[PDB]
Structure formats: structure tokens, C-alpha cells
């Protein structure tokens, strides 16, 4: 809960079955290009290869997986320290947002805020964020190397039904923060009690009335048919 | 179905606070080849750490939920083959009694 950054991170395995340059790049939120994994671990702090590979492959006897990770090391080789790895990431905006000191500072923040927002969105938790990114690459390769089976998108345990209460949570939040801005608006106007309790009531009503779970009478894309009239033909119905 | 229910949403911390005091090594201090076969622990897709003998932990966890201490709606699965122990406090999961 709270703001709810629905930022999805992909870890892509470039090059197909029987092609050279089987490189691993990851599309990071608020970043134009797909950054090679090694630059990430380095930008994260994990500077040398092997320290990077330790996070990805755990068994030092799994040569098959490691040979697969060799081109990644090659790709990343260009960048060497934590700083030059962040600068490379800052070079790719947004837009770009010119100035060296600026681009380096960006990427510092994208990692704290946008990158793997769960776990922690705090500061010094690079350790956790790395081991996890690695756990992802590990799972990515495990499938390419025909060991784990490709995830069933339609497995039920992987689904969640949003019931009555959480449907309201999404709605109440949207409107409370809409009141919160009108609250700041009347506090501003006070160059020296007028807090419109209507927005919340009318909002909740509009929503449960139409079924249009959006904001507000200006609907699409809102999500309609959420609420609906209770069928009363028979007690079964 | 007539027996189907939905997870309301509980707190992960009383399980996180428990797990540490039960044999969980924090992820900040992991040595991938020193402790290699270590069963990795996740609470709501957040990788928290590793446990040495998951069989003992899995038995203590199951008993808290079955007694009452850990909420009964809290999902907890141990894949022996995959060497993982994933726990769920997550609101939304459809459950059934058995």
C-alpha cells in the first residue's frame, strides 16, 4: 500500500537458441535503454566479476550456467567502478538531463526509489537488491538451460481476487489525496473550516452507483461493471 | 465454491521477527559457496535470507499456524527440490479448508 508504484522490471536474455552474443540486459524504470546486468551490480556496489557471478550462480560446479554468464562479463567489462556504472545509467534518461554530476546523482535515486521497490525503497540495502536481481538472472538462465519449466501464467495460486474492501481502498485513497490537495489549496489561499467533505461522499457514491471505479464523472479508462444491482429472482440467484 | 474464502491481509513482521530468531541468516551476510545448499526464505516475494535445516523451521512454523499464533489464513509452502521456503501474508489469495 502507499502511492503503489506499479513499476514492472524485466530481465531480458538477448540472442536466440544457436546465436552468439547471448547477452543479459535489464529494462530499468525511468531508463530508456536496457542496461547490461554487470553494469547494474557495479552501479549497486558489487564491483568485480566473480563477486557478481557469486550472486547469480551459487554452485561453482555448474560450468554450463557460468559459460552462459561469460558474454555478460564481456559486455560489462567497459565500465569498471561504481561511479562510471552510475554515469552510464544517468546518460540514459527520462531524456538525458545534461551535466555529469546531475546524471550520476539521478542514477543513485532510481535504484533507491524505482528499482525493485519492494524489499526496501530506503537507502543502504544494496546487498538485498543485488542478491535478488541475481536470484532473478539465476531463474532466467535455469529456464533457458532447460532445468526449470517456463512459468504458467494461468496458475491460480499466482492470482488474487480484489474483494469489496480493497476495491474501496484503491478508491478512498484516490479521493483522500484529492481532498489532501484541496486542503493545501485553501491553506495557500489563507494569506492571514472550509474542507469540502462533499468530494469523498459524492466520489464513493458515484463509484458504487455507476460501477465506474474511476475519477470521476469523466470516465474511460476507469474500469466499469465493478458494482452492480443485486439479482433477486430466486434466493439462489 | 461453498468452502472458498479470500485472504484478508495480515502483517508480515510477526513472522519476519520470528524467522530470524529461528535460524534465518540475513541476506546482507550471505556466502553463496560457504553455505551453498541453504534453503532460501521469501515473505511476500521479498527475499529475507537463508535457513540451514529448513525441515526443523517448517515444522515449528506449521505448528504456530495450526495452534493459532501465526494467522490461519497465512500461506506457507516448502519446495524441497527447488530449495525454497516461500511465505504469504498477501491479501487476495483464494483458500479452502482441508
Amino acid at each position: 500500500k502507499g502511492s503503489r508504484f506499479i513499476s514492472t522490471l524485466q530481465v531480458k536474455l538477448y540472442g536466440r537458441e544457436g546465436s552468439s552474443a547471448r547477452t543479459i540486459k535489464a529494462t530499468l524504470p525511468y531508463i530508456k535503454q536496457d542496461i547490461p546486468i554487470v553494469i547494474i551490480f557495479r552501479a549497486l556496489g558489487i564491483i568485480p566479476d566473480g563477486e557478481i557471478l557469486e550472486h547469480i550462480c551459487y554452485d561453482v560446479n555448474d560450468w554450463q550456467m557460468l559459460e552462459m554468464l561469460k558474454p555478460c562479463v564481456e559486455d560489462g567489462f567497459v565500465i569498471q567502478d561504481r561511479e562510471t556504472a552510475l554515469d552510464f545509467i544517468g546518460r540514459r534518461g527520462t531524456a538525458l538531463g545534461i551535466k555529469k554530476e546531475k546524471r550520476i546523482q539521478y542514477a543513485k535515486d532510481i535504484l533507491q526509489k524505482e528499482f525493485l521497490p519492494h524489499i526496501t525503497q530506503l537507502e543502504g540495502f544494496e546487498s538485498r537488491k543485488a542478491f535478488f536481481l541475481g536470484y532473478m538472472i539465476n531463474r532466467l538462465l535455469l529456464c533457458a538451460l532447460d532445468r526449470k519449466d517456463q512459468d504458467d501464467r494461468d496458475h491460480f495460486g499466482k492470482k488474487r481476487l480484489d474483494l469489496a474492501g480493497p476495491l474501496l481502498a484503491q478508491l478512498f485513497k484516490t479521493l483522500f489525496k484529492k481532498l489532501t490537495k484541496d486542503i493545501f489549496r485553501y491553506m495557500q489561499r489563507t494569506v492571514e473550516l472550509a474542507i469540502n467533505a462533499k468530494t469523498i461522499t459524492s466520489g464513493l457514491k458515484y463509484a458504487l452507483a455507476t460501477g465506474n471505479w474511476g475519477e470521476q464523472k469523466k470516465a474511460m479508462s476507469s474500469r466499469a461493471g465493478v458494482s452492480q444491482v443485486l439479482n433477486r429472482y430466486t434466493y439462489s440467484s | 465454491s461453498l468452502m472458498s474464502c479470500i485472504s484478508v491481509g495480515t502483517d508480515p513482521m510477526p513472522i519476519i521477527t520470528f524467522l530470524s530468531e529461528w535460524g534465518m541468516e540475513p541476506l546482507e551476510d550471505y556466502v553463496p559457496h560457504q553455505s551453498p545448499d541453504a534453503t532460501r526464505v521469501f515473505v511476500n516475494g521479498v527475499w529475507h535470507g537463508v535457513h540451514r535445516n529448513p525441515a526443523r523451521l517448517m515444522e515449528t512454523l506449521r505448528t504456530l499456524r495450526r495452534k493459532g499464533d501465526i494467522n490461519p489464513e497465512v500461506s506457507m509452502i516448502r519446495d524441497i527440490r527447488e530449495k525454497e521456503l516461500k511465505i504469504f501474508t498477501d491479501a487476495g489469495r483464494v483458500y479452502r479448508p482441508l
Binding site: 500500500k1 502507499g2 502511492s3 474483494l163 469489496a164 474492501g165 480493497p166 474501496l168 481502498a169 478512498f172 485513497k173 483522500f176 489525496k177 489532501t180 486542503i183 493545501f184 491553506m187 | 479470500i6 484478508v8 491481509g9 491479501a91
Partner: peptide
């Protein structure tokens, strides 16, 4: 579901970015 929403979820949405230059305390439902 609604019970979890009133008893808890509601008290939570009430204070997350609530504090304004004026913050919000405990919520009461008649």
C-alpha cells in the same frame, strides 16, 4: 473484506502523506 477495510485499511490511508505544512489523527465511523 469490508471489516478489514473499516477496522484497519481506512485508519492507514488516513495517514501516509496526511501531514501538511496540519496532519490527521484517529478516524471515527458512526
Amino acid at each position: 473484506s469490508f471489516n478489514q477495510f473499516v477496522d484497519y485499511t481506512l485508519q492507514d490511508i488516513i495517514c501516509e502523506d496526511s501531514t501538511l505544512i496540519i496532519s490527521f489523527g484517529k478516524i471515527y465511523v458512526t
